[PDB]
Design a protein around this nucleic acid. Structure first.
Lengths: 50, 149, 87, 207, 102, 126, 119
RNA sequence: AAACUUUCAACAACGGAUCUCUUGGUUCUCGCAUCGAUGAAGAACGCAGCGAAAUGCGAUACGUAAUGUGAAUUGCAGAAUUCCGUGAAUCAUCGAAUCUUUGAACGCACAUUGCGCCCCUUGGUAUUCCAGGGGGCAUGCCUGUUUGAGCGUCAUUU
RNA sequence: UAUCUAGCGAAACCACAGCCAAGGGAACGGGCUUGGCAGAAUCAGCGGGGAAAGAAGACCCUGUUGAGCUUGACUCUAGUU
RNA sequence: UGGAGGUCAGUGACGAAGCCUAGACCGUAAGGUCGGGUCGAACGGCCUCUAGUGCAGAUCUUGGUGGUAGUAGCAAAUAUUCAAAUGAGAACUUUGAAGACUGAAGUGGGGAAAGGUUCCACGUCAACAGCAGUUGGACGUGGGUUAGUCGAUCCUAAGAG
RNA sequence: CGAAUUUGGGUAUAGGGGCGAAAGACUAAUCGAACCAUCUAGUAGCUGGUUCCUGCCGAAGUUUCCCUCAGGAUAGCAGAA
RNA sequence: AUUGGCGAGAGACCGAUAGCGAACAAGUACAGUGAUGGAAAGAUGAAAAGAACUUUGAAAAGAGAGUGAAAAAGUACGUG
RNA sequence: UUGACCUCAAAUCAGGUAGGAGUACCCGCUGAACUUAAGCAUAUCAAUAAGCGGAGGAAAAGAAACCAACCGGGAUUGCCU
């Protein structure tokens, strides 16, 4: 909003850290059910409603 | 909603009885727990008989006054007639009822005789010293069964 | 147009973040959260909300402290420390 | 569970929506949204007539009726024909009922108890068990009922002087007090004629 | 008793008694006992009230008035309310089914 | 059978306990039977596996192949013995997972706690 | 490597705190060095060593505070034992066992006797 | 006649049916009583060498201390006679602490990482101004302490 | 635009499908019976038909089904006196 | 048909179950059996017990797939063309040349709300952009937002409390 | 198209309530009573569906009553014992 | 008394459209302003031994080769 | 003038305590309606659900201002009747 509360700007930060793909060495871990970042979020697809 | 020669079945289930149904699957389980409770109480208070001594009293009403049954406790008049004090009787394992009154001689005679044969059949350890090794009996009522006159 | 032309005018914020429940359910004009009942001391929860209780009940999150109390009681809330040095 | 098929807020849309009248999940954007529920025909809906705990599990049986059955089951063990038909290798058994000396009650170690059972003639039946151990057919094998096996001779005693412990580990053969004499092992599968080994004291106590 | 108890939540309501009355108010003096005062914690003639089971006994209805309101009295007049009318109602509306049906 | 009520004869609970046991519990689950000779001079039927013990493979494709433990891979309930690998077609050598119950301990790494472990089990430490 | 607790407890306050600064210095040196080298796990050791050191400093102070409040009433709320809120509002063993003089007279006069029946 | 339509078979597809398995549920039984103003449940944000989750934890941050075990963790990297040891482990146990910002939340406030005040202390020339650090400041109620108020009232003194 | 091509590429609808006349039939048949007939596959239009599709008819009737409203329907009721 | 008790010391990794079979046989039929192929780990006959036991329909539920059909459509915003480069591949990328348009109540330059990293660079085109793609608001990796003066903070309005 | 003008932000009114220059209009695509969850699997004399084979027997739409006429009860017809 | 909590044991229970909504990063993704609503998704193989290497193709990939008992098990992985 | 006392205050006074969570069970308060009555109003659902307040491992009740009418029983609670 170009003028945002700081508690909003913390919502900003973890949005950016979480918006990254699953690390590729997770595959190599034993009995790994995890296949992809299911909680992946994009601004183009869905909104984060803060 | 009614037809044929069928009796009028008064079933009281218009309410939501389903949330309030209690099915006793634990009947076997509670019996084992109760027997365990009897076992642990006896082990706790050994060698006292795990239960009190109840007087033999006549049942009320015209229907049951033909049967005697184990009442609550010995009336104070019966305790003194046995030569005791109410407080002492409670400690040595005699159930005492203060609100019951003795108005029948035959019942009174049985109870004071019940107390007299209870005293002569129990032994009491002294407070101080080496208590004699006694074997715990588990049913005072069985040892002094209620008798039909 | 009560639909798509009107949807364009949806650019305000009825609700914002609630400091207690962290949901985007804190009504601004009412100055109260619609989920946890902020700022009222009692955490807004109803029996008719059978699922909503399940979402925000004990056990939902971290259990910072209540998690260990089961172990603490089990050992007896005992204090002090152990003695034996090592193998 | 009493709330199975009901942790849902389904509600029918009615007619005029080209869809059936079964109640449907509200909301949106789930895949589950707008799906039928609350019915017995719906994926995720409740079952028809949910099984309840208060179904009659245990069945009353007349005491004289149970005792009548036990007497018949006991009398069936004396019939060598029924024992053979029920599937017990008693063809070479010289005498039915097979009665052994009461000293078997005092045997403490499994080695001597099985050795006695071999000699008294129950050898073949004990080999029929512990060789017929088959994996159970069907979904019951992962409900702690994995293995099935035949039942061996029923050793009946009067006083447990160690016989119950000695034979507790031996497959098939099971010990039953003559005072109790439970029917569920005298007539397994309601089939009369369980091969029974009697001890001398238990045989006397039977009368 | 309830409004006094919720005002001073650190005290238990021992009792209360009518002290006066007018057209639009009734006046009660509420006997309160402090469970966290060492004087009352000691003297075990009164240390039963600092037991945690007795906190806010007026809200639950355990004082003299609460016993009266719930009708917890011995007698045939109180057959519905002898140990708690909801317990008796639940007692006499349960379907008690057994392992071997009766 | 199961006479003490505390222990469970449930397949699901036993399997869950095995597959979710921590590293400490996995160590005793990875027990290794001693050889005929090692039993004779010690008197213990089986011993928990250790990173520096000489072992022999008696079951599987690796039957008869000796070796020395290189790493107790407790996470997979397996052990990695040296010189017993499988060459990948690229030429790389990846070790073979082995269950300790299929291995026979030919020699022990005798540390002072291990010497106490043998004594507590009834060992003469020859 | 890394420092260990048992030898740290021997050390007094001033030099224990002095090396706390030393560890905090060297952690900073590895922190700037971490961004350069692709892999640097040694920061784990010093972070663990820092926590070990200042764990001892806090413990030593607390032991002194217990010494400061030894046997005197009104210990600080963090030093007094955290059992349970229900337990700390609960009656003490001496206090629950407290009885009125009338009750104790009856107990001594007519205690629960021990007896048995010989059948 | 081919093409096309239809039918069937083999093989191949689409799809996840059936069968088998099951660290899940469900029901029953047994046992225990165990949250919080000493700060609870919950939330927010962070913490790993390379992690987005989940799990754990809180600037001591996938944790530290104590205890037991006894030589690992593991996907890679790294360290690894730390190895006959007060000693590895994403180990267990857990009795000591830490426990950010919150939250009944408690200095006021909160759509703000706002505004404050007091004490001690360090620095800037500094009782006063600005900073740094530490510790405090909610409400209601109880017991007591001190200071009090009221011709409510008593005595005393001109 | 439609048309054709290259690329991409749905939905409605669909018992099976798709030639008529007459008869009868639930009294207006694509199928039944009697006749006419009938030759693969189709493309663009088209608006006769498929009692075409879009909605468990909104009109009407029934329901011992509701709701809105009204009143000197019945019974109550806040309020006020 | 799912499961339970018994029995056939039943069958089975030399191949159980399952599945397919215009292959065979039995039964009036419900169905049962056998052969052939795939298959990999359990499963049957009989005497009884028990039930969440038999589907073509419910504008049935869920999942999937069809004809319609390579069809309708991808036709408002006047409009693009040539060459070179990159690239395997250019109607669509970049540059240049032209031609145009918005025509200063603009398709411009900024901002409030809102969004939240789309901003920027490098690598890349599996998905996406209605065609395409070497391009991108896509994908991967990183960088990027500096205030004594700009605002918030302060004040009060309608109001809330 | 200079005012009963339009609009932004703040704020107030919340469901038998609000607001209405009054249309039963609007109150988050929902309005002659919003949405959400629970009581609730509400009710229905009404519509649709109701899952294997074979054998044997095999009807009824009528009597009487009912706020009964789309339904029940009763007698009748039928099966089985 | 107890469908909450902790721990424990069983079942003629269900067996991935069933059973808790949730066998799995489940009250998660996601939708709604909000109260709330709320899924789908299990199994390669004994072990990755996850296809080295050669060739066509820009590449994907294919054809070979190869591992593996089986590739009629290739991560789009039990059967299909 | 000075001491009291009585009541009422204040204090970042000394020391404490209450709040909130969970809520399966328990103790009260408040409290419907759907439904049934083949209609519906008393009745029923129900002294229930929802709402509110308050605890524990259980809670509540509890040692008669009881039941009885008997040859009388004898706190409370729960089960079969």
């Amino acid at each position: 909003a170009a003028q945002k509360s700081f508690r909003i700007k913390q919502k900003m930060a973890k949005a950016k850290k979480q918006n990254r793909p699953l690390p590729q060495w997770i595959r190599l871990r034993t009995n790994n059910t995890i296949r992809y970042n299911a909680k992946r979020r994009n601004w183009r697809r869905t909104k984060m409603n803060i | 909603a009614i037809s044929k020669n069928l009796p009028i079945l008064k079933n009281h289930f218009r309410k939501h009885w389903q949330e309030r149904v209690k099915v006793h699957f634990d009947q076997a389980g509670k019996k084992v727990s109760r027997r365990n409770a009897r076992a642990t109480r006896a082990a706790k208070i050994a060698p006292r008989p795990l239960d009190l001594l109840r007087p033999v009293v006549r049942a009320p009403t015209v229907k049951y006054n033909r049967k005697v049954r184990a009442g609550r406790g010995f009336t104070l008049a019966e305790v003194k007639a046995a030569g005791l004090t109410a407080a002492y009787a409670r400690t040595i394992g005699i159930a005492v009822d203060h609100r019951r009154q003795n108005r029948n001689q035959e019942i009174f005679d049985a109870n004071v005789q019940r107390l007299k044969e209870y005293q002569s059949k129990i032994i009491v350890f002294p407070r101080n010293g080496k208590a004699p090794e006694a074997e715990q009996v588990l049913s005072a009522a069985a040892t002094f069964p209620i008798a039909q006159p | 147009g009560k639909g798509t032309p009107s949807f364009g005018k949806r650019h305000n914020k009825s609700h914002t973040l609630c400091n207690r429940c962290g949901r985007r359910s804190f009504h601004v004009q009412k100055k109260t959260c619609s989920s946890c009942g902020y700022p009222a001391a009692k955490t807004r929860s109803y029996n008719w909300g059978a699922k909503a209780k399940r979402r925000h009940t004990t056990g939902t999150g971290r259990m910072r402290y209540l998690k260990h109390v089961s172990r603490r009681f089990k050992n007896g809330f005992q204090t002090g420390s152990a003695s034996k040095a090592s193998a | 569970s009493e709330k199975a098929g009901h942790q849902t807020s389904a509600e029918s849309w009615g007619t005029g929506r080209a869809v059936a009248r079964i109640p449907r999940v509200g909301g949106g954007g789930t895949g589950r949204s707008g799906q039928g529920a609350f019915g017995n025909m719906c994926r995720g809906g409740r079952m028809f007539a949910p099984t309840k705990t208060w179904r009659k599990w245990n069945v009353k049986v007349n005491h004289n009726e149970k005792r009548y059955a036990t007497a018949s089951a006991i009398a069936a063990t004396a019939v060598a024909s029924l024992v053979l038909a029920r599937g017990h290798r008693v063809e070479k058994i010289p005498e039915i009922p097979l009665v052994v000396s009461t000293d078997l009650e005092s045997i403490q170690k499994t080695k001597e108890a099985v050795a006695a059972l071999k000699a008294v003639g129950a050898h073949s039946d004990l080999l029929k068990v512990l060789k017929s151990k088959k994996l159970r057919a069907g979904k019951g094998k992962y409900r702690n009922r994995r293995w099935t096996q035949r039942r061996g001779p029923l050793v009946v005693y009067a006083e447990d002087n160690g016989i119950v412990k000695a034979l507790r580990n031996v497959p098939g053969v099971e010990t039953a007090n003559v005072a109790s004499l439970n029917l569920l092992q005298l007539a397994p599968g309601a089939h009369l004629g369980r091969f029974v080994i009697w001890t001398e004291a238990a045989f006397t106590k039977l009368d | 008793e309830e409004r006094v108890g919720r005002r001073a939540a650190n005290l238990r309501v021992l009792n209360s008694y009518w002290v006066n009355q007018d057209s639009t108010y009734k006046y009660f003096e509420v006997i309160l006992v402090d469970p966290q005062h060492k004087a009352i914690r000691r003297d075990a003639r009164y240390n039963w009230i600092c037991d945690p089971v007795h906190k806010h006994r007026e809200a639950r209805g355990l004082t003299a008035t609460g016993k009266k309101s719930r009708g917890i009295n011995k007698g045939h007049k109180f057959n519905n309310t002898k140990a708690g009318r909801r317990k008796t109602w639940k007692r006499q509306n349960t379907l008690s089914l057994w392992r071997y049906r009766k | 059978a199961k006479q003490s009520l505390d222990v469970s004869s449930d397949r699901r609970k036993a399997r869950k306990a095995y597959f979710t046991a921590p590293s400490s519990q996995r160590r005793v689950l990875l027990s290794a039977p001693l050889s005929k000779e090692l039993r004779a001079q010690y008197g213990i039927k089986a011993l928990p596996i250790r990173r520096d013990d000489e072992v022999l493979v008696v079951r599987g494709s690796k039957k008869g192949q000796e070796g020395k433990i290189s790493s107790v891979y407790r996470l997979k309930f397996a052990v990695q013995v040296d010189k017993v690998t499988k060459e990948k077609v690229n030429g790389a050598s990846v070790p073979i997972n082995l269950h300790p119950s299929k291995l026979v301990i030919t020699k022990l790494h005798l540390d002072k706690d291990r010497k106490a472990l043998i004594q507590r089990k009834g060992g003469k430490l020859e | 490597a890394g420092v260990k607790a048992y030898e740290l407890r021997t050390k007094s306050k001033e030099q224990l705190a002095s090396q706390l600064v030393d560890l905090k210095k060297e952690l900073a040196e590895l922190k700037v060095q971490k961004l350069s080298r692709p892999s640097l796990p040694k920061i784990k050791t010093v972070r663990k060593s820092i926590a070990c050191v200042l764990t001892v400093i806090n413990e030593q102070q607390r032991e002194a505070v217990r010494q400061l409040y030894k046997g005197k009433k009104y210990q600080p709320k963090d030093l007094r034992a955290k059992k349970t809120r229900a337990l700390r509002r609960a009656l003490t063993k001496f206090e629950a066992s407290q009885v009125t003089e009338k009750q104790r007279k009856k107990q001594i006069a007519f205690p629960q006797r021990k007896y048995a029946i010989k059948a």
